[PDB]
């Protein structure tokens, strides 16, 4: 799968959230997952997230056709780690998930181009 280069707070975000804290979106989300398959993992996080906005759906819609071949469990197990965490925190899961909506973008772009 792939997107293109083509596709307001800015990164002044760290004035408001301690950059030294744990994030939902981080290195561990990608453990065991090959380069060629990162955009597909990053689609799953996009589609969990929205589904549980305008800019986001423009990127999502395009990735309907994005899949891999063979078993994707090594991917879904990583995504499920995020979902479990974005629920176990309840309110805070939602808000923390909502709070990193931009990291989801930086990661999406970077994997899909």
């Amino acid at each position: 799968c792939r997107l293109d280069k083509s596709n307001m707070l800015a990164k002044e975000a760290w004035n408001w959230d301690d950059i030294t804290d744990v994030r939902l979106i981080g290195e561990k989300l990608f453990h065991g997952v090959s380069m060629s398959e990162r955009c597909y993992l990053m689609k799953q996080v996009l589609n969990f997230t929205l589904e549980e906005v305008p800019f986001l759906a423009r990127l999502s819609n395009r990735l309907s056709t994005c899949h891999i071949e063979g078993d994707d469990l090594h991917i879904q197990r990583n995504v499920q780690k995020l979902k479990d965490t974005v629920k176990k925190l309840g309110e805070s899961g939602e808000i923390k998930a909502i709070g990193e909506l931009d990291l989801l973008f930086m990661s999406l772009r970077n994997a899909c181009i």
Partner: antibody
Amino acid sequence: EVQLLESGPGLLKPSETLSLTCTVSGGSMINYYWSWIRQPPGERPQWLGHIIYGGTTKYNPSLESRITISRDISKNQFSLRLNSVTAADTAIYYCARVAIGVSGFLNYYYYMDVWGSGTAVTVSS
Amino acid sequence: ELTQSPATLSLSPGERATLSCRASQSVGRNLGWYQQKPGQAPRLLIYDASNRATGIPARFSGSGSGTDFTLTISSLEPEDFAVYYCQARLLLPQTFGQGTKVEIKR
């Protein structure tokens, strides 16, 4: 050039409250973190805590129950309070500006890039 | 955590000095080195493994990545005999390494 000037008392008695202020000149407090560091005699520098522009703090857990860090953006100051001092708190205390940002694989950098000249704090009866 | 070697380095002026820092887990390239002379505040020397901080002269250089890092002073001047500390991210309880003291050999 950005300059940080610590201000605090040189001498305290046990059980007093230490309080120190740093005045930031020649730069702004937005887009940096602001830290307190101390260096006990004979030791390496030790990080006490930081504060971000928004007011969230993080503290060294070993001082956690005694330490407060605050900031006053309209004055370009930030402050340290440490309760119930003993001889164990004797050290040179430094304020430091922290440069932070994203780097590596979804990670960060953190450098104490501008330091005050330090204020010696002795606790003694 | 960060391990500096050696505790003390005894060298002659004009000599080249090489200091090591090893991290127990990767810090990528986000390591810094600081200099402190006696009486004075520490000072940032090198950041992101190899970039000279403001005002730092050309004889100071650094390299490494992951876990293994090196600070080089290509020709020691009188003013360079001091303690050097490494630091990477916000590591607790010890944010700084133990330090390497660069002493004049005679």
